[PDB]
Amino acid sequence: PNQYAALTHSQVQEVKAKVRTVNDKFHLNAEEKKLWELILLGNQLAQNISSCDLPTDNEDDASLVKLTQIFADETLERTDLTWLNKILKIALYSRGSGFGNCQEKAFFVFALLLHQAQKPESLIHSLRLATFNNHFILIVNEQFLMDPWLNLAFPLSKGNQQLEIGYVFERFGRLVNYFSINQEGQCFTHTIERDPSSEKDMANCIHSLLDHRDYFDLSI
Q: Does 1 fall in a domain?
């Protein structure tokens, strides 16, 4: 039993059941299936990062997860870094250490897809981190929702989107945006605000991800 779990076993099994219901009704085209497979691989790669707040987690990992969480809290409080850089530094620390909770794993997949989005003719166009309280998720191309904490993903019907988000996460409350990058390369940070400092920091941030390419390698 994981005393530190932030959801119950049943709460998890319910979400998985609804993601299954949702994925059954979605029939994707070829290009959507390519991005889909990348999203699945990215979520799966994120499971290298061990959490301690799921019922299936090992309570023996609680202290090393707390170490990442203290690093993350201190990093987010810094005044000398942009928000994009804070997110990426935490992504890198979590992957490098192998420990992180929901926030860290969401940040890692954001970093992975931001890195992938630089590759020639990538299908990655937008990335939106948003939260149900402290439960982070990632919306890709306003077309897919990823939950690396739970290793689940499902498509969204572009337009009406609270039908599937509101179905899967019915008893999870309001989704609040956290940080996003649109197809134009503009950055938004937490109600939403344009984030020109992150925009100006973009290249240096992308460079720091290249310096740990192995953290994000999905190559066959």
A: no
Q: Tokens 């959490």 appear where?
A: 51
Angle value at C-alpha 201, between 200 and 202, nearest 5 degrees: 90
128 forms beta bridges with: 139, 180
Assess if residue 195 is contained within a domain.
yes
Q: What is the rounded distance in angstroms from the CA atom of residue 73 to the CA atom of residue 63? A: 15
Experimental technique for the deposited model:
X-ray
Question: Which residues make beta-bridge pairs with 138?
Answer: 129, 146
Produce one character per residue of 46-72: b if its CB has 16 or more CB atoms within 10 Å, e if not. beebbbbbbbebeeebbeebeebbebb
- In the chain, the number of structural domains is 1
Residue 4 domain-assigned (yes or no)? no
Q: Where are the beta strands (DSSP E) in the chain?
A: 127-132, 135-140, 144-147, 152-155, 176-181, 187-189, 193-194
Query: Containing domain of residue 138, as a range?
Result: 9-216
